Structures are given as C-alpha cells and as structure tokens.
C-alpha cells in the first residue's frame, strides 16, 4: 500500500495534502467502494467495505482526512504444542491440560460434506499438524484471542476535528495493524501505528515457538500511548509504504517482517525534491515505475560477461542496457521480469525449497508459495553474493542458467500487455461461458511489486498483474472539492452496469476523478437520484 502527507510549509496550497493507494489482490468486485455519507452528526466521504458500516480506513469528514498502509506489526504468533492423551491434553509448564475438541462440517458445492475436528488449546486453535501424533501448531492472533472493540472506533472517528482527536477516537482498534496517516484543517499531519500488539519476545517473530515453556507467552498489551506516533515532524513529510516503522532497537518488539523500503524511499525522494507539492503531483508519484534493482542487475550481469548461447547473450545485452523502468510501453521490462521469474524458479528448485510445502505442517489455507517468498529474498542473497542455498552453484551459474531459460520465454510484448491483469470474477471458472461478461475489462499497465506503481504478480504463475492499487486518492485538506480518487474497475458490482468497469480507464492511466464533497455540485451532477422513505 503507499501513503504520504505533506505539511503546509511544503505544499503548493499552504494546507496539508494526503495521498496514496492501498494494494490488494484484484478480487472482483474490489474490496473498497467509494461512498459519501452525510447526516446531522457528520459529513464524510471515502472508501467503505461493502457489508461493513462506516469508513474504517480512508475518509475525510471535512476537518480531518485519514488513510492507511498495512503496518506489518507482528500480530500473530504460532506455537508448537506438545500433546498427550491421544491429542486430548497439551503441555503448559510441567502439566498436561485438557484441550477442547469438537466436530464441525461444511457443505461443498458439487461434492460431499466434509466433517473435521476443531482442536483448541490455551494458545488457540490447532491449524496444522495432527495432535494425535504428539505435536501440532496453534495460532494465537490479535484478530481472535480476546474481545476486540474496533467497531467502537467507527462511531467515534466521524466526530474528530483534529489529527489528535482522530488518534483518540481509534483507541481500542485491533482487527488489523495500520499506519494511520492523517491531516487536518488546522494544518497538522500525523502518523499513528493503529494496532493492538501483545508484549512478548523478539524470538516469537522468527518461528513457531514452544507453547509449554512459558518463555514465549504474551505479557499483556503494548499500551495505546506506547504505540509509535509522530505529529508535525520537522521535515514536513510523512511517508509510509509497509516499510519497517521503527528501528529494531525500539524497546517493544513490534516487527520482524515487512516490505523492503524501495517504495517509501522512492516516494520520499520525490517529495524531498519538491518542497511545493501540489494536488496534481500525486498522480506522478502513483505512476512511478523505476525498479530498485536495475543497478544490482546491471553490475552482476556485466560482471558475468558474454554467454555462449546466442539467445541468452542477447537477453543479457538487453538487461545490461535497460533503463530499469517498468513502463507499460517497455518491451525490455517484460524480459527483465521473465528473467527474474526464471531466476527465482531455478533458485527455489535448486535449494529444495520448492518441496518445503510437502510437509503436513504447510497445510494452512491458502498455503505459502516458495517462489512467491524466495522472489523477495533473492536480491539480498545476490547482493551479498550469498550462495549458501544453491547446493554448490555460484550466483554466476544461477544467473547464466536463468539467461538461457528466460531467452526461451520472451513473448516480445510491451510490459503493459505482458502484465495486464486478467480480472477474474469468483464464478468465472465455474461458469466459463460467462467469463466474458463476468470479468471486468482490463487495460495494459506497468509497474511491479517493487515500484510505487505496485502492480505485483504471482511469480510461480506468470507475469500478469494479480494485485495493485485497489484505489488511488489525494486529499486537498481544507479545499475539499479538489480531492480526487479512483477505483480499479468501478462503483458497480453488476457486470451489466455502465459502472462496472468504467473507472478502469482513468485508473490504468494513473489518473483520478473528482471526489465530490459540496452538495450543490453533487446536486448539479447527479445522474440518478433516489428517495429512501419511511415504510
């Protein structure tokens, strides 16, 4: 996800500007929908979650604007339990205690019912492994473990008038951890880590940990007032982009895993170069396609030297010359992607990680992708030249092999056409003759998982974009009708609707449409108007 705020002393307007874009899988219809809701208590516009009241993540109310990126706090622990009693007891300290067992059943369209066991220890439910064999994994997650009052925040947030009031209003939010970045008409900007995080050791962040020893238990909650926050920082710039929120010597353990800092860095760099950021400048940072890896790729391939195979040497010259932009127009960007996919595939097979998911402990739906994980770690290992997992190969051998393989996979398509998402309705595989109607129309788009324009992919599956900005927005705080937004297909979830897929056009261009707040402009532009009346 990306967001940023720019302080009044660095904007073209002399008021805050907030902008960004949440990144999720392109499930259809999009998880977020645009709404404007007014009553006597509030007048708010932003993104809603169909089926949930309110504006949990993205909105302004005419005084404060707010938006989020996923913080990558560590909010889920896995415990290795030791069981006995044929699964009926689990160890805690030096005592084995009764475990909860019950039975449940789901129905399956076109198949038989599945019956199954729900096993639960004092840490939580068993999600992997068979307790009858003596060990299994349980999950203790802030999302499930204790009473959660996040829904109380939804009725308080609309009434906030300043950044600080917004942050009070979110007290008790724990369903998910967000960098909540906010701006207000008084001129403030802020970033709060909005999350409930248990107090417990750094070690729990690396692996499932022993459920019996007491070394690894939660010791209460990190207090609200201890969560990282900053308000009106002195550089006048806030950026968050799933990157590590605080240094690891911070006194509470908060994070082991997060996204690399490429996106935040590139956003930060462009904002730093522009101390008169205007509303119109948001769209250019959304669209940023520079890959952080061009330099490393170039050095390594350079040092690799001419190949013997002819297709492979051609691929090499092309990659060595590439400007590193994942532009929709760029054919060489597809070839970089093909090469990186082949590289990642080879490293995964070679190391045996491809088969790591054979183990019964891997069976937590929807499962981990070895290629999808290794893809992000390859740059580190390549940069450090660490061939520790390549079973005798050097990186130069992997690279060379990847040139050979990748050269057979060059479609020649511009990256836009190579990467174009195939937006797949949930019923398209069950009703394939309806796929044409059900799947909203998609256009060519650039970017990849590393670029601010974060249209990422499934490396084991192919180059096609599978996740990216579900929406983009910029808030002109205190000149609200100048705010703008877009969603990746449209407001409607009805494949027949004129608004099922019409926003895909500006979205694919990285352009946005007016986020209208004045009722008099809304009245002037209404296409349909409906009264919803008492009985």
């Amino acid at each position: 996800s990306n967001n940023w705020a720019v302080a009044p002393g660095r904007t073209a307007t002399g008021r805050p500007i907030l902008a960004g874009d949440p990144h999720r899988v392109f499930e259809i219809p999009g998880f977020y929908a645009q709404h404007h809701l007014a009553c006597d208590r509030f007048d708010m516009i932003g993104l809603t979650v169909p089926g949930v009241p309110g504006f949990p993540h993205f909105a302004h109310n005419g005084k404060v604007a707010y938006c989020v990126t996923h913080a990558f706090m560590d909010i889920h622990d896995l415990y290795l339990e030791q069981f006995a009693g044929e699964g009926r007891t689990a160890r805690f300290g030096n005592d084995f205690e009764p475990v909860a067992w019950s039975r449940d059943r789901i129905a399956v369209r076109g198949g038989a019912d599945r019956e199954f066991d729900i096993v639960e220890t004092r840490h939580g439910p068993v999600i992997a492994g068979d307790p009858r064999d003596g060990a299994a994994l349980t999950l203790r997650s802030v999302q499930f473990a204790e009473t959660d009052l996040s829904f109380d925040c939804l009725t308080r947030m609309p009434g906030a008038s300043t950044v600080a009031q917004l942050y009070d209003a979110t007290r008790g939010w724990g369903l998910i951890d967000h960098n909540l970045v906010a701006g207000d008409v008084a001129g403030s900007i802020g970033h709060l880590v909005r999350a409930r995080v248990p107090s417990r050791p750094r070690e729990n962040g690396w692996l499932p940990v022993p459920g019996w020893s007491g070394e690894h238990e939660w010791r209460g909650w990190i207090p609200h007032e201890a969560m990282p926050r900053v308000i009106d920082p002195p550089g006048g710039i806030i950026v968050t982009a799933n990157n590590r929120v605080v240094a690891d010597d911070h006194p509470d353990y908060l994070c082991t895993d997060c996204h690399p800092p490429y996106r935040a860095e590139r956003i930060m760099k462009r904002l730093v170069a522009n101390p008169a950021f205007a509303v119109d400048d948001a769209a250019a940072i959304h669209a940023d396609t520079l890959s952080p890896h061009v330099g490393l790729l170039r050095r390594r391939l350079e040092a690799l030297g001419a190949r013997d195979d002819s297709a492979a040497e051609g691929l090499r010259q092309m990659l060595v010359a590439w400007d590193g932009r994942m532009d929709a127009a760029s054919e060489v960007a597809s070839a970089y992607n093909a090469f990186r996919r082949a590289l990642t595939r080879l490293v995964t097979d070679r190391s045996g990680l491809e088969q790591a998911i054979s183990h019964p402990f891997a069976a937590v739906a929807p499962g981990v992708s070895p290629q999808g994980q290794v893809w992000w770690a390859v740059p580190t290992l390549l940069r450090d030249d660490d061939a520790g997992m390549l079973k005798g190969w050097s990186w130069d051998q992997a690279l060379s092999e990847a040139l050979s393989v990748a050269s057979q996979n060059l479609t020649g398509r511009s990256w836009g056409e190579e990467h174009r998402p195939r937006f797949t309705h949930p019923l398209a595989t069950q009703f394939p003759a309806w796929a044409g109607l059900l799947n909203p129309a998609s256009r060519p788009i650039g970017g990849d998982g590393d670029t601010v324009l974060a249209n990422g992919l499934v490396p084991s599956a192919g180059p096609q974009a599978t996740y990216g900005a579900l929406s983009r927005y910029v808030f002109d705080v205190g000149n609200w009708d100048n705010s703008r937004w877009v969603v990746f297909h449209g407001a409607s979830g009805h494949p027949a609707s004129a608004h099922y897929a019409d926003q895909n056009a500006p979205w694919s261009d990285c352009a946005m449409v007016p986020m209208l707040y004045s009722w008099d402009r809304i009245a002037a532009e209404a296409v349909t108007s409906q009264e919803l009346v008492p009985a």
């Binding site: 219809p29 929908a33 645009q34 709404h35 404007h36 009553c39 208590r41 009241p53 996923h70 990558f72 560590d74 896995l78 290795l80 789901i106 399956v108 198949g111 729900i118 999302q143 009473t147 959660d148 009052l149 109380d152 009725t155 369903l175 070690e203 690396w206 692996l207 499932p208 990282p228 900053v230 990157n243 590590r244 082991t256 895993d257 690399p260 930060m268 190391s351 402990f361 739906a365 770690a377 580190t380 940069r383 520790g388 019923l427 407001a491 409607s492 979830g493 009805h494 494949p495 027949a496 609707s497 004129a498 019409d502 009722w519 809304i522 409906q530 009264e531 919803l532 009346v533 009985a535």
Partner: protein, 216 residues
C-alpha cells in the same frame, strides 16, 4: 432489468425520515440523511444495491460457507475460519460493544435486510448459482470486516521459515525474509535509517530443535 432500480422512491422499514441518494457521473453514491441511524440504514441499503453478491460472498467466506458457492477450491479456507472461531469471536465482540456501535450495526443490517425485501431482481450471480440471499444479523459486519484483514502479515513468514528448516538448515532458513535494500528507511522518525536485527540462532536453538523433532 438485471439491475436494481436506482431512481424513484423505495421504502425502508425503520427510517425516521427520507434519505436522498445521488449517484454521480461514475455511479458513486452520495447519501444524505438527517439522523445517524437513517444514515447507516441507507448505507446498508445502497451497499446492497451495488454489491449484494460481494457482501454475501465475503460473509460466506468469513463463516466458512463459501464452498457452498465456490465448490472444493474454497473447502480448506472454510475449514480454517471455522477452526478460528469466526462466529464466536464476532458475537463476543458485538456483545461487548457500546450502545452507539450496536445501534450503528443494527441500523446497518436493517438497511441490508430492507434491500433483500425490496423486490429488486437478484444479481446475475444468484441467477447462475440458483441461490437466494440470506438475511443479515448485526454481528455479520464484524465477520466481514475480520475476513478482509484475515491472517495478513507475519504468520506466513513464520510458517515459511519453519518449513524451510529441514530443507536448508537453520542458518539459511533464518535468512528467508523480504529484502531490506541493504538498510531500511524507517517511518518513525521520518527519514531515519537503520539496520534491522538478524536472527540470533543461539537464542532460537531450542525452538529450532523442537521443530526439527516435531517435523521429522
């Protein structure tokens, strides 16, 4: 005529006053109510006019009933959310909520239920599936909200490093994480940088050994 009516007037049991819903040039609804309860009721209603299939599909995924629509490919995801106790923790959450949040949730689903009773034609998906929509309870929104962020973040990485243990060894498995570009840009303080801490194999040894044994 595969589409619900977006003009005229439509009744909602439980409204105190009229609510006006204007859809702009992109179909985005701008909803104007007097009271807050009317606002939430109208939002339930308008959500459903555009997104009924999404809402119910997302709820079914939350409640482990999606395989009833999607078949075997959703079976294992349904089993997982059942094991997690979605219904139990969403009911629990709802009972603990203050009166304004309870009222917002109740108003919201009375708007959803009002849409279901409105006599709109059903979305094309219900036609395909031969299905009829099921009514909404207040705690259902909590389940839909929980489903949206379900298991996001750290669990996958821990599960992955554990799976790598017997394949590549401890020293290697503990390097399996997203790159840091050589050194993180932090969010707080803005602009600050720092080197992340690498795994302490010595402190992790007993966890590692326990898992090796358990997995082997």
């Amino acid at each position: 005529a595969a589409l619900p009516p977006l003009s005229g007037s439509l009744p909602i049991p439980g409204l105190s006053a009229s609510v006006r819903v204007r859809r702009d040039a992109w179909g985005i609804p701008h909803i104007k109510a007097s009271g807050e309860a009317d606002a939430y009721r109208a939002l339930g209603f308008v959500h459903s006019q555009d997104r009924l299939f999404q809402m119910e599909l997302t709820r079914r995924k939350a409640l482990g009933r999606a395989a009833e629509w999607l078949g075997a490919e959703a079976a294992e995801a349904d089993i997982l959310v059942r094991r997690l106790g979605m219904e139990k923790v969403c009911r629990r959450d709802f009972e603990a909520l203050g009166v304004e949040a309870k009222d917002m949730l109740r108003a919201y689903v009375a708007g959803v239920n009002a849409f279901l009773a409105s006599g709109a034609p059903l979305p094309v998906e219900y036609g395909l599936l031969g299905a009829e929509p099921e009514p909404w309870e207040p705690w259902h929104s909590i389940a839909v909200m929980r489903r949206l962020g379900l298991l996001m973040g750290s669990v996958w990485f821990k599960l992955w490093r554990m799976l790598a243990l017997p394949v590549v060894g401890a020293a290697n498995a503990l390097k399996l994480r997203y790159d840091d570009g050589g050194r993180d840009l932090l969010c707080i303080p803005p602009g600050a940088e720092a080197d992340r801490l690498e795994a302490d194999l010595a402190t992790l040894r007993p966890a590692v050994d326990a898992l090796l044994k358990a997995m082997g």
